[PDB]
What we know:
- The complex is a heterooctamer, with 4 copies of chain A and 4 copies of chain E.
- By secondary structure, chain A is of the alpha/beta class.
- Chain A has a single domain, classed as Rossmann fold, CATH 3.40.50.720.
- Chain A is built from 8 helices and 9 strands.
- In chain A, the strands form 2 sheets. In chain A, strands 3-2-1-4-5-6-7 form a 7-stranded parallel sheet, with helices on both faces. In chain A, strands 8-9 form a two-stranded antiparallel ribbon.
- In chain A, α4 (108-129) links the parallel β4 (84-89) and β5.
- Chain A is globular, with a radius of gyration of 19 Å.
- Chain A starts with 6 loop residues before the first strand and ends with a helix.
- By secondary structure, chain E is an all-alpha fold.
- In chain E, α1 (3-17) crosses α2 (38-52) and α1 (3-17) crosses α4 (67-77).
- Chain E is globular, with a radius of gyration of 11 Å.
- Chains in contact: A-B, A-C, A-D, A-E, B-C, B-D, B-G, C-D, C-F, D-H.
- Chains C and F meet through α2 of C and α2 of F.
- One nicotinamide-adenine-dinucleotide binds next to α1 and β5 of chain B.
- Chains A, B, C, D: GO terms for molecular function: enoyl-[acyl-carrier-protein] reductase (NADH) activity; nucleotide binding.
- Chains A, B, C, D: NAD(+) binds at residues 12, 18-19, 63-64, 91, 161, 190, 192, 194-195.
- Chains A, B, C, D: Belongs to the short-chain dehydrogenases/reductases (SDR) family. FabI subfamily.
- Chains A, B, C, D: Keywords: Fatty acid biosynthesis, Fatty acid metabolism, Lipid biosynthesis, Lipid metabolism, NAD, Nucleotide-binding, Oxidoreductase.
Amino acid sequence: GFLKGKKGLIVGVANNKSIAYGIAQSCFNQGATLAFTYLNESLEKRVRPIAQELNSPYVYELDVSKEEHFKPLYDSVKKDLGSLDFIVHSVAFAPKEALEGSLLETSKSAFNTAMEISVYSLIELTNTLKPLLNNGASVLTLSYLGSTKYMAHYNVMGLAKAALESAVRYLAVDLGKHNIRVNALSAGPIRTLASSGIADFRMILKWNEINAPLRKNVSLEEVGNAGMYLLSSLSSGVSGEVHFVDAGYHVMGMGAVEEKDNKATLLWDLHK
Amino acid sequence: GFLKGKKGLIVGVANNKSIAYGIAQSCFNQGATLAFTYLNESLEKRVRPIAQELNSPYVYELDVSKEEHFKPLYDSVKKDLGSLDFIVHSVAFAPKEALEGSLLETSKSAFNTAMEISVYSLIELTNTLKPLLNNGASVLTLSYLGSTKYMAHYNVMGLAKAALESAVRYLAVDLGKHNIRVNALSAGPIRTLASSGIADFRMILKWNEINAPLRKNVSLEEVGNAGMYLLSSLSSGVSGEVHFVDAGYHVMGMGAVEEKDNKATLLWDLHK
Amino acid sequence: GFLKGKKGLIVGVANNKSIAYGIAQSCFNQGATLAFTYLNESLEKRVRPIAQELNSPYVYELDVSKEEHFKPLYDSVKKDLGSLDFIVHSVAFAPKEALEGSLLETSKSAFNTAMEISVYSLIELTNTLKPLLNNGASVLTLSYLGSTKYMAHYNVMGLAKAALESAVRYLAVDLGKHNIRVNALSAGPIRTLASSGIADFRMILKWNEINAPLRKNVSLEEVGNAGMYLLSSLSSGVSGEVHFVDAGYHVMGMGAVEEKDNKATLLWDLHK
Amino acid sequence: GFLKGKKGLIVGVANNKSIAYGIAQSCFNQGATLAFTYLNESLEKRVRPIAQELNSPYVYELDVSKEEHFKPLYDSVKKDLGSLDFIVHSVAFAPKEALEGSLLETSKSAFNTAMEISVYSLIELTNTLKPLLNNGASVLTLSYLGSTKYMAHYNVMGLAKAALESAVRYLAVDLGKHNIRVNALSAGPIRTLASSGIADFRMILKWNEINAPLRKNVSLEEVGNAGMYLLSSLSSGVSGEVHFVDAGYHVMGMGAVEEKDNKATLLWDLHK
Amino acid sequence: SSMALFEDIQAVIAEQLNVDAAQVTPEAEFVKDLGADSLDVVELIMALEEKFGIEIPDEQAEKIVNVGDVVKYIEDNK
Amino acid sequence: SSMALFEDIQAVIAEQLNVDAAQVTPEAEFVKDLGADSLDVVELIMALEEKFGIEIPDEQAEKIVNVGDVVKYIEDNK
Amino acid sequence: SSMALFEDIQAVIAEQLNVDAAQVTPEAEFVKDLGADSLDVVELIMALEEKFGIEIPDEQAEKIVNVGDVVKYIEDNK
Amino acid sequence: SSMALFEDIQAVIAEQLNVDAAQVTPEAEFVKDLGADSLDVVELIMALEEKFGIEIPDEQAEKIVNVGDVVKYIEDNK
Lengths: 272, 272, 272, 272, 78, 78, 78, 78
Ligand SMILES: NC(=O)c1ccc[n+]([C@@H]2O[C@H](COP(=O)([O-])OP(=O)(O)OC[C@H]3O[C@@H](n4cnc5c(N)ncnc54)[C@H](O)[C@@H]3O)[C@@H](O)[C@H]2O)c1
Ligand SMILES: NC(=O)c1ccc[n+]([C@@H]2O[C@H](COP(=O)([O-])OP(=O)(O)OC[C@H]3O[C@@H](n4cnc5c(N)ncnc54)[C@H](O)[C@@H]3O)[C@@H](O)[C@H]2O)c1
Ligand SMILES: NC(=O)c1ccc[n+]([C@@H]2O[C@H](COP(=O)([O-])OP(=O)(O)OC[C@H]3O[C@@H](n4cnc5c(N)ncnc54)[C@H](O)[C@@H]3O)[C@@H](O)[C@H]2O)c1
Ligand SMILES: NC(=O)c1ccc[n+]([C@@H]2O[C@H](COP(=O)([O-])OP(=O)(O)OC[C@H]3O[C@@H](n4cnc5c(N)ncnc54)[C@H](O)[C@@H]3O)[C@@H](O)[C@H]2O)c1
């Protein structure tokens, strides 16, 4: 098992549809000792049973907007685990109003919330836990094509993911001299609990399914296996990377076509 | 003159070494009616004479962290100019401590300052002035290779520029349907007043000069001409673009070499 | 006029819809002394009158597959012009069969033709004319988004443009130490004589018009002005760059949307 | 074992330092049934023993410049294996003279050799073997950062790798509708038998080691594990991807620095 | 409401909010009477549309408040 | 063929190939009788579809050989 | 201090801060006695190093407070 | 040549080209007398420089032709 005996902290499980869960589950099947965090008591109800299922008693409170939660999280990990081999940062947030309409409409406070919660928390979490990381440790965050290309209504969250991918590059430099790796997994759209906060996610999901090279949406298992890879020693030469797990969708410069011997037609134009 | 009769608001002049000044000066030589803003009274002392020199009585107060400055700026432009054909957003800031050492060290408040001042102000400025933009208007911001590649000590400002380039893409979509363009000019390092806030800027400037394809640093005139181009109707098919004006430096995946018939040698290794 | 007194060789005019013509025309309006080449006698009929119109007696034969044409072209330029300040390489070709269907179907001979004609000719043309280039000379080639993203049926010509953009980077390094610049202009789809060789170009042109930020196809004038810029001293800090002149289309990661207060809808889904 | 029962054809083993060998070895440790090809009899001497070691009797002749070798290779695979789940295309070549000096010097025949051997052979190999691919098959080729950034003396091979990465995108589209994946692994420099054909490879290897985030060159095992991942069902949501396995080197926009409390210094400037 | 439809929707709501079927009555409301946060509801909505192959649009999703709403909606669209 | 249509198409073909209108007869063929290469034809086709707002598809474009073809085609699709 | 050096540095400081040379004395300090903000100083520093081809490092730059400091520094490094 | 050095280099060449040590004499040449292609040699060179921590530069690498060359070279640079 490629993570046998390796300790990892999973941040961001909301339910068994969370990207964080897929990753945690794939790492479990590879023999990882997991620990989990939860936003508040409403989320502890959901994390702590799932943690149980992945054979884990280590369940800690972390609201990344509460500076005061981080020292306790450090102490908990040192008490119960002593060291970490990987960290999964699977967390983002923006107010509903910002994930719709235009970027021009965005409030300064919505901006600051999207940036603090979705980007700065990787800095504070990695800085907090840096003293406990073992040789070869691997830090993983989650991004989206909306960072470097326009995606409908993704707006301020595209700005956050662009910064997030840039943070991955700088953190990879900062931490690489201590032989620690930092990567982003850029998932394709996948029906999750936070992804329902995106206006007409469903249409983005369809557009992806029709137009991706593999003519499928990605499965939660596919994101988890890719994540597991990046967390595992299999990827010990990979750092600073933005790894697309999106059924190939990133390569498309235009809608997919299909030919009827006559014209070419957009695939999109066949179903309706 | 390619901007004869065209009205433009220059945001960010600090002295005659400011990138904003080079741009403003190039636009002047192309016949533009300019207006300028200043951070505070300390900066009004420097803007208002330079504005004079570029034949401009329109000098307004804009501290982009003061929400209350934007409605007055709107009113001033409507009174004195009535409409705008272009806007130059040449503004960024981060506390000294963040532009040195690691990204891991960065404070949440330094983060929020870098993001608000350097990225969100493009949203608030363009949203504020959007009702006054003419057909074909052109909005220009200023970025740096540190956005998508690691540059020494650029740290949180790399995160800001990544978001900034992503904002350019979304704003280009938002505004393009009203036939308004939005671009970033990604300048090479250039000795300016804010660029002295970067730890060992001088060495970054040297590394660029030695290793750029053209073996020179860029001149203030070169950034201004590139900017003028992007502001002018010459570039009316260009939007969402990040335009490198850096003596070609972005193409280098490694230090430049030069051969002595024997080995190859890094150019860097010749002068010392 | 930004190219007054500057000598330039335009390679690739086919008629007054050729990208090369737009560029040549924009440079003319900036005061350039032009010279032109033609593929064969069938094309001399069309070049030599257009050259006349742009005030040029210098019209030379160049089939880039004929190694033996290049020494004569050198001699002609030295006789009639003595030196060059810029070169426009606006030339590509692939057999019909390769610009349709799949890449898998491509013949080795179609591959070799696409690569020789569309990429290697930039090397042989720039190497041939390198001794005649003045200080600050500027070499421009023409590319397409199909190089780094999938575009329908673009197939082997995407492979050629990827190489072509890579050649621009290496040539920019090779030539930059002699203070010579090399760039690519990446045009959006535009109805030209060679572009009719692309299967269902018309649909690619429509998809671009609907989905580009500026909701327009680019005009021949817009490509020419962008080209002129890159050829002129205005861009003397720009080298190794791939400059998109495509109405902003490159930023789109998906079809454009528009909201009816209810759902979001693809713009494409409104007209049919 | 993640490739238990899965059949794969390894193209490009030269000795036990070949990238192809690392990949083949990693796939072996995951339970793959391998088959191998060799350039000629000089190379059969080296492939066939290594194949033996990886438990394989299937060793076939393939010189990718011999069109006539491909039908026999098809027949051999159908006879002995019946189907394929993955293909490793680990093959490139250019004459010595082209991997040194400038791109401008390159001969048309060197160009054609680099393109045919290094790029077109992926088309002919995948087209030939396409009828034998199973559901979920995975096609892997090998690239280098020299494709999209300038690397010293990489010259025509940068052009080839740019095309190669573009071919990956188009092939991913072509083959994805049959649920077949196509990727490139972009390795960092690694001392191999062909890599000795690159002028001052040793200095490129050193520059990478000093300046990569992880301050190490990549190991043959690290490339093999990354390859195995891309060949395995673990990456079944990954297609059209260029996956960097380079100790993080791709993120660097400049030489690495390190601070002595005083100045910053290039790491390169410490050892000499 | 069709009784087979209501009972089947009732089982989903029951399991989702870990309440007894008995407490799931057409008048009951997820926030007030059923103890559901913003997550419970969103999770429950997906469970329903996934179960029924239909999709509650987001605009229609907000306007739901009570068990009857989801039932009367689903019956009109299945 | 409608005479107004033919005459208007005839002027286009005339100007495009710099021949006299007199030589532009329905039987005439662009390659053989009118001295048109592969460019002349493609340029001429665009001139026609641009003029007439319609678009000759590429499949229909090949199957054209003579003045009558372009005329009979355009009349059926304008 | 060398008098030619001081006078030449004094002209720079004078012009830069638009004060009279008379007020530029070795004891004077840019913030306190010369009315210079954080920009004035940074601009003035660049003027000096550009003038003198040398470069005041940033660590040495902070430790400057008075006209004498910049003068004694420049004389030691020109 | 130092006899310990020669014998140690001789074992490398022997194993690398799968010849008997006896045939590895200072006069012998890899292409002619030892049956080595362009790969054998390049592989053998790496084996040597890796073994000896030194690096034969490519310019010096070509100029090697015989066992004596590699031996006399290595002794001068180890
Ligand atoms: N289509 C997708 O679902 C998709 C695609 C690509 C990337 N991503 C990214 O994946 C990551 C996980 O999102 P998901 O789709 O699995 O949604 P999810 O709702 O399952 O996970 C979001 C997690 O963020 C946690 N969170 C939010 N604010 C927090 C805070 N202030 N403190 C601590 N935790 C907080 C949420 O409680 C939840 O645990 C995010 O970065 C998301 O942007 C999602
Ligand atoms: N090497 C470089 O100098 C370089 C390179 C690439 C990009 N840039 C970017 O160019 C732009 C201009 O910087 P510059 O180098 O010309 O420095 P500069 O000091 O000349 O310009 C910075 C401007 O930002 C203004 N500013 C800062 N905070 C402000 C605020 N809160 N409200 C209003 N104005 C504020 C400053 O007062 C000044 O006018 C910035 O985006 C910078 O990041 C600079
Ligand atoms: N949509 C577009 O039209 C579009 C978009 C982006 C880039 N481009 C590129 O622009 C450049 C010009 O193409 P265009 O669209 O203006 O078409 P065009 O037909 O007007 O120009 C093509 C030119 O290539 C010349 N040519 C072909 N083979 C030649 C040879 N063997 N020797 C000398 N000349 C030869 C042709 O004769 C013609 O002059 C090409 O690189 C094309 O790929 C075109
Ligand atoms: N630094 C590196 O070594 C490095 C880095 C990145 C990518 N790559 C790529 O990895 C791949 C493998 O190279 P390597 O470094 O393992 O070198 P290698 O010499 O071990 O492998 C090269 C293989 O190509 C085979 N080959 C050459 N011409 C052939 C032909 N005409 N027909 C069939 N086979 C032929 C060679 O015989 C050999 O088997 C190539 O694409 C190379 O460009 C290498």
